[PDB]
């Protein structure tokens, strides 16, 4: 809750986007796990649209970099103002702005159509119109006369809920409150920490429900969400930073019915 307060998005981003968990260069690793996921899930045609939503976007693009090709209109979310404060900075192209080249070329590279990493981060910075203050503690968790086009034809979200819920219950409301923005038939996108208690973030120490893959498949299906494909990567010993106690990854694709 008030833990939030200390979080430091340079520290998180350094935590978990640069090296060793942010080198993309080993296929074995959870960066480019992810962004195959993404990948692969968007390249079979099936998640498709107008808008999309991210929900908890963190300081962080990457989770959208095989997503932007396929949605016109985009909105980045986040309940802190550093955080969208962070993001203003790579989409405006300003100073100290965090680097993603590294990602934008990986995620060029997994897509295989040949496009250059700097039309890639082009088609980002074009398609995401607005970065919004968000709580999925909330019923209506955008608020009221959201300036996001509702509902969504697709939603993303990257270790959000898990990490900003007590337990199993909050996770399951908070999965509830932001289901509401996406529009029946839509898709979801869940990428999250498995079997996590705890993440670093600077001065800020978070607390996490550990959640199973189960749990979570079982979350999507009471959310009322049909589960079209669930994985799960194995965090490697060498990536166990103590920046955390994460043990895996989950990557859930869902379909609201
Ligand atoms: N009550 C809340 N509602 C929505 N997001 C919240 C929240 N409380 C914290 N958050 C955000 O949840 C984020 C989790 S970190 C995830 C960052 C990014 N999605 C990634 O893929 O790395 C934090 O940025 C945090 O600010
Ligand atoms: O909070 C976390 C954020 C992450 N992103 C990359 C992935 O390694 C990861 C693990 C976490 O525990």
Known sequence: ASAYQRFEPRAYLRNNYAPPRGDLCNPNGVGPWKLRCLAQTFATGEVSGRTLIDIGSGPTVY????????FEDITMTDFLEVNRQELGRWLQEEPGAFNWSMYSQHACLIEGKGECWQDKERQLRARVKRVLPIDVHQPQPLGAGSPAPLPADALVSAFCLEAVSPDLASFQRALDHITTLLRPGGHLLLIG??????????????????????????????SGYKVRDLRTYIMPAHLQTGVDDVKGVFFAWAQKV
Do not use: D, I, K
């Open 63 to 70: 989770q959208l970099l095989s997503a932007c090709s396929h």
């Open 193 to 222: 920490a498995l079997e996590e208690s705890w993440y670093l973030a600077g001065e800020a120490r978070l607390t996490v429900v550990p959640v199973s893959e189960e749990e979570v498949r079982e979350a999507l299906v009471r």
